[PDB]
């Protein structure tokens, strides 16, 4: 019933200059139902939350649900309005509202309030704390992260790699490759974006694997192991979604 104001607060917090750093085609969409459940979705890939970013305790990610078919997840890829709509559709709820800036909102209006945001309406400080990304998309994995003592952290990960040398941070390239179909509205840009994001996911995962296997600090490999498990989930979801639409 309440916390529409909390929805617009977090809707202004995603829309800050902390992480919206000139990413072509990136935007967020926030929505709330008649129950009071908050759902967000971005326009880059599936189950993506940016690095070192936290979400509040009520917030569900639209592209990260398990009660929803993977084929209708992939159908709503890069189109976050349609994503929160489909989340409400199978999750039985009626959407009370969608928040954002009206350029993003021009697509759909089925009984939705269409809340518009202005340069004073959004503060330019993110400032929100809650769940780490592993705890948002895979809380099963976040619970067996928490029952791992700081010594035995390598039992969650596969073995140390056959190459001792670091693999090489090529991510600034793969990210770029990822942004290339987002400059298009042709049929099939969605799939090409998902393939490039899957390659970014796998390389990020290999970097976190090596980062955990080479470090000797507690919080450092806990970062690296949580990163590895998150990208394990993301790579798996992208593989299922790319495979189900052939």
């Amino acid at each position: 019933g309440d916390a529409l104001r909390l929805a617009r607060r977090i809707a202004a917090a995603l829309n800050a200059s902390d992480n919206n750093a000139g990413d072509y085609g990136f935007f967020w969409i926030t929505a709330v139902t008649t129950d009071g459940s908050i759902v967000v979705a971005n326009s880059y890939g599936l189950a993506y939350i940016p690095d070192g970013m936290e979400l509040p305790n009520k917030v569900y990610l639209a592209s990260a649900d398990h009660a929803i078919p993977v084929d209708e997840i992939a159908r709503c890829a890069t189109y976050p309005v349609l994503a929160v709509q489909a989340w409400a559709a199978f999750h039985d709820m009626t959407l009370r509202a969608v928040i954002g800036t009206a350029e993003q909102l021009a697509s759909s209006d089925p009984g939705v309030a269409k809340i518009v945001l202005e340069p004073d309406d959004i503060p330019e400080s993110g400032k929100m704390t809650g769940r780490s990304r592993l705890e948002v998309v895979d809380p099963s994995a976040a619970a067996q992260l928490a029952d791992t003592t700081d010594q035995r952290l390598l039992d969650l990960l596969p073995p140390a790699p056959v190459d001792v040398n670091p693999p090489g941070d090529e991510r600034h390239m793969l990210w770029f490759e990822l942004m290339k179909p987002m400059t298009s509205t042709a049929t099939g840009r969605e799939a090409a974006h998902l393939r490039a994001f899957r390659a970014y996911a796998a390389h990020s995962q290999e970097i976190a694997l090596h980062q955990a296997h080479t470090a000797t600090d507690a919080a450092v490999q806990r970062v690296a192991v949580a990163d590895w498990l998150y990208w394990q989930y993301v790579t798996g979801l992208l593989d299922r979604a790319l495979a189900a639409a052939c």
């Binding site: 750093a21 072509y24 770029f176 942004m179 290339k180 400059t183 042709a186 090409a192």
Partner: protein
């Protein structure tokens, strides 16, 4: 009425006409629409070439009929179908900008199409110049003469129609060649996209202003591809069957008169 005139006109009508071209039109580049245009021209030229051979058989039959008409005044496994239509794509799907550039400038860029158009337009002009074979008679008069003049007139009108269709295929190949040079002018050249990718690779500091150019570079490419999918879709050339030549059978032997004094 004269017999030697008929015997000469039969040889004249049976004679070889122009040799049609046989060289295949090769696609200007490696884009699918370019290949579809080239393949449609291949099928059109093949079908036209078969129909012209059928017209040659008709002129042979007309010559035989003229010889039998001259003997009256004395003493001397498949059939033609339509042209197949290459199925063409609608609005194109997403394509990588570097890949579209690499395909657009890989090929002869329209040389084979120009040679095709030259050959078929010359063929046009040669059939047009070769229609005195079908003119009227000077001395030969009567019912059979009028029927033979009508048959020759039908072959003349069919030959002129065939010349028009040869001109149409030539203009089709010419059009696809002009469309390809417009596409080479408007699409981003490969050196520029590779240089832009490298300029993002050098200073990721410029990463917030390289992306509005690439979108610009994408959008155009996509106008090019949409137009090249739409305008390189050629109608197949369906020639009419050549009209049947008049059939005049060999006459019975002539009765010698003044016989039985």
């Amino acid at each position: 009425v004269d017999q030697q005139e008929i015997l000469n006109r039969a040889n004249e009508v049976e004679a070889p006409m122009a040799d049609p071209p046989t060289d295949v039109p090769i696609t200007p580049c490696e884009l699918t629409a370019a290949k579809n245009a080239a393949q449609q021209l291949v099928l059109s030229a093949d079908n036209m070439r078969e129909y012209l051979a059928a017209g040659a058989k008709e002129r042979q039959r007309l010559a035989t009929s003229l010889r039998n008409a001259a003997k009256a005044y004395g003493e001397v496994s498949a059939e033609l179908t339509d042209t197949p239509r290459v199925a063409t794509a609608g609005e194109p799907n997403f394509m990588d900008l570097k890949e579209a550039a690499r395909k657009l400038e890989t090929g002869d860029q329209g040389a084979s199409l120009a040679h095709f158009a030259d050959g078929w337009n010359t063929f046009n002009l040669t059939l047009q110049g070769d229609v005195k074979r079908f003119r009227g008679f000077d001395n030969w008069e009567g019912d059979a003469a009028t029927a033979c003049e009508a048959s020759l007139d039908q072959q003349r009108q069919w030959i002129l129609h065939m010349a028009k269709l040869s001109a149409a295929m030539a203009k089709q190949a010419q059009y696809v060649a002009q469309l390809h040079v417009w596409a080479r002018r408007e699409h981003p050249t490969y050196e520029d996209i590779v240089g832009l990718e490298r300029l993002y690779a050098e200073n990721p500091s410029a990463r917030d202003q390289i992306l509005p150019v690439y979108a610009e570079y994408q959008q155009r490419s996509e106008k090019v591809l949409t137009e090249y999918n739409n305008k390189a879709a050629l109608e197949p050339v369906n020639p009419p069957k050549p009209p049947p030549a008049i059939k005049i059978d060999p006459p019975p032997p002539p009765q010698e008169q003044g016989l039985i004094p």
